[PDB]
């Protein structure tokens, strides 16, 4: 049938447009997700992970990619858009996309607009998948265009910011509903 739902930390199914912190499934691995700028050019802000297990970062709002389904439950292995509930000096979209499959370099997850979108423009499509670890309800994030790429964190202890991107070990996460918000 249609895929099973993703669950929050309270056991409830994720809903479109509700606000969830994206926490490490293992707090020993760090904090939630935030935005971090260039050193030189500040904007667009990259999505990064707070190294402090006590910091929840910004919550995210998740919406089905493509045609609106009637129930609004976020399902596993299903393309979704992800954007931060946050306000910036950049005054630009806080929606995530991954660096184009067609660009040279490392692939990071970033926010805001791109000059030169790819033809399909699927770089803003992400999927949540089950992690074979998940004694309890824990997930990995991936981006799929012509191939699928799981997301990990580029850790740096400098430390520069810990950028989310195409790197393994993968970043295993859990979704915590923002408290009455």
């Amino acid at each position: 049938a249609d895929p099973p739902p993703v669950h929050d930390t309270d056991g409830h199914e994720l809903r479109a447009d509700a606000n969830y912190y994206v926490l490490s499934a293992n707090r020993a691995h760090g904090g939630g997700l935030t935005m971090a700028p260039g050193h030189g050019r500040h904007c667009p802000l990259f999505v990064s992970q707070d190294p402090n297990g006590q910091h929840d970062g910004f919550p995210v709002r998740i919406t089905p990619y493509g045609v609106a389904p009637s129930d609004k439950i976020i399902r596993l292995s299903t393309d979704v858009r992800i954007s931060f509930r946050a306000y910036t000096t950049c005054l630009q979209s806080t929606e995530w996309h991954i660096d184009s499959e067609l660009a040279a370099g490392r692939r990071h997850v970033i926010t805001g607009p791109v000059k030169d979108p790819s033809p399909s423009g699927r770089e803003n499509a992400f999927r949540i998948e089950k992690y074979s670890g998940a004694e309890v309800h824990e997930y990995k994030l991936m981006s799929c265009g012509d191939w699928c790429q799981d997301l990990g964190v580029f850790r740096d202890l400098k430390g520069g910011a810990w950028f989310l991107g195409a790197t393994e070990p993968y970043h295993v996460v859990v979704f915590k509903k923002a408290p009455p918000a």
């Binding site: 935005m35 802000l45 910091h55 931060f84 509930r85 306000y87 910036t88 000096t89 005054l91 918000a181």
Partner: protein, 269 residues
Amino acid sequence: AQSVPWGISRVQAPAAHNRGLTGSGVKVAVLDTGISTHPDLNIRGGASFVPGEPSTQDGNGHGTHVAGTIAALNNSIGVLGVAPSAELYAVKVLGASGSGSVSSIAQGLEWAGNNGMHVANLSLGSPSPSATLEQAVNSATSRGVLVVAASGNSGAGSISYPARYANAMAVGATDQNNNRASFSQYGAGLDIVAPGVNVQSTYPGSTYASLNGTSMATPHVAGAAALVKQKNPSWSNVQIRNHLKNTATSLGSTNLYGSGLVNAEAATR
């Protein structure tokens, strides 16, 4: 020696200064990345609402630049604000990273209400709606704060939040030919425009820098509000807002420019 940035002359602030209006006695909060102590600013106080970043000093530069466009001191150095005698408050609601939550920003607006700010400048935003953030804007407005916010930099035909909320005055950016800068968002929510290209202002480490953005446009209006308020101390936030719009120089469609280019000379005449 002191330079008058071109946007300061475009909004006609020196003509207001010549009629004894410099914004003295007007409390202006800058809700932003903080404000660094700088030779060309006078910071009266403020607060931080950013977890882990307890001081009101600017680790980004943005809030310091915004503050100079409002109130850079009239002296023999650096630049000059629209309202050089305005009483400046640093309300840090964005981290050094440049981003803030609904809750940091909402506590900054609550601070502005509790401390009798006359103007809050919010050169910040995103396309993210939030009922909690709208409530905070409404609440500050009900408590006498004139909330002034940047229309956004995406180039789109609707404006950013919180500027898009009705009781924020939304400000777009113009260039040196009075044209809409191409990044400047517009739409029915827009109230007015101001210079937002090549805007030199104060910058941390006792420096100056030239930035482009609707974040640069907004302080021109927050400063002009302060001039109108000095002239008319019994006027509400609403009367000041209407008068700035009624006296703006019309530039073409209200959808692209709102009332048009803010005019501190006409607003204080």
